[PDB]
Design a protein around this motif. Sequence first.
Motif, PDB file in Angstrom:
ATOM      1  N   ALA A 136      35.860 -13.983  32.872  1.00 34.22           N
ATOM      2  CA  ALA A 136      34.507 -13.438  32.962  1.00 34.22           C
ATOM      3  C   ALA A 136      33.901 -13.332  31.559  1.00 34.22           C
ATOM      4  CB  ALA A 136      34.523 -12.089  33.670  1.00 34.22           C
ATOM      5  N   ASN A 137      33.837 -14.491  30.897  1.00 36.34           N
ATOM      6  CA  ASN A 137      33.399 -14.634  29.511  1.00 36.34           C
ATOM      7  C   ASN A 137      34.382 -13.964  28.557  1.00 36.34           C
ATOM      8  OD1 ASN A 137      31.693 -15.807  27.687  1.00 36.34           O
ATOM      9  ND2 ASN A 137      29.995 -14.366  27.970  1.00 36.34           N
ATOM     10  N   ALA A 138      34.300 -14.301  27.273  1.00 33.76           N
ATOM     11  CA  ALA A 138      35.207 -13.757  26.275  1.00 33.76           C
ATOM     12  C   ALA A 138      34.442 -13.474  24.991  1.00 33.76           C
ATOM     13  CB  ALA A 138      36.379 -14.706  25.992  1.00 33.76           C
TER      14      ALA A 138
ATOM     15  N   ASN B  96      34.620 -19.080  25.449  1.00 33.87           N
ATOM     16  CA  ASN B  96      34.634 -19.097  26.905  1.00 33.87           C
ATOM     17  C   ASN B  96      35.060 -20.472  27.403  1.00 33.87           C
ATOM     18  OD1 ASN B  96      32.323 -20.276  25.914  1.00 33.87           O
ATOM     19  ND2 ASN B  96      30.893 -19.137  27.215  1.00 33.87           N
ATOM     20  N   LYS B  97      36.284 -20.553  27.921  1.00 31.48           N
ATOM     21  CA  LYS B  97      36.820 -21.802  28.448  1.00 31.48           C
ATOM     22  C   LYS B  97      37.987 -21.491  29.382  1.00 31.48           C
ATOM     23  CE  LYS B  97      35.363 -25.140  27.382  1.00 31.48           C
ATOM     24  NZ  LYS B  97      35.752 -26.112  26.323  1.00 31.48           N
ATOM     25  N   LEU B  98      38.468 -22.491  30.116  1.00 24.44           N
ATOM     26  CA  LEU B  98      39.526 -22.315  31.098  1.00 24.44           C
ATOM     27  C   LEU B  98      40.860 -22.130  30.389  1.00 24.44           C
ATOM     28  CD1 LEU B  98      39.868 -22.130  34.120  1.00 24.44           C
ATOM     29  CD2 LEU B  98      40.356 -24.587  34.187  1.00 24.44           C
ATOM     30  N   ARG B  99      41.692 -21.243  30.931  1.00 25.50           N
ATOM     31  CA  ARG B  99      43.000 -20.956  30.358  1.00 25.50           C
ATOM     32  C   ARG B  99      43.985 -20.658  31.479  1.00 25.50           C
ATOM     33  NH1 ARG B  99      47.325 -20.867  28.844  1.00 25.50           N
ATOM     34  NH2 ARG B  99      48.159 -20.271  26.797  1.00 25.50           N
TER      35      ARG B  99
END
Length: 48
Positions: free
Chosen positions: A20-22, A26-29
């Motif tokens: 939910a954003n960082a 912001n990317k897939l992990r």
Amino acid sequence: DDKNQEIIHNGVYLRKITVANAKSKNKLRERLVPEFAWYDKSEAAYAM
RNA sequence: UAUGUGAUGGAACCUCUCCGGAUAAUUCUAUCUCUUCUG
């Protein structure tokens, strides 16, 4: 394992959770999400 | 529940009129499912 009434998760690994954003990027992990046993005991793709 | 020197009621067809009709190929591809924890 198989399906049970206790519906308690017994698993680890697989799937990459979307954040939910960082604060920085912001990317897939990938994360070690708990999962339930598949229902196969076409009954080839199931999780919780 | 009569009243008596007088009852063709066997003395009268519920008869007549009206298309259970109209419309429909036993055919066939896009998902399904909501809570994840600061990452």
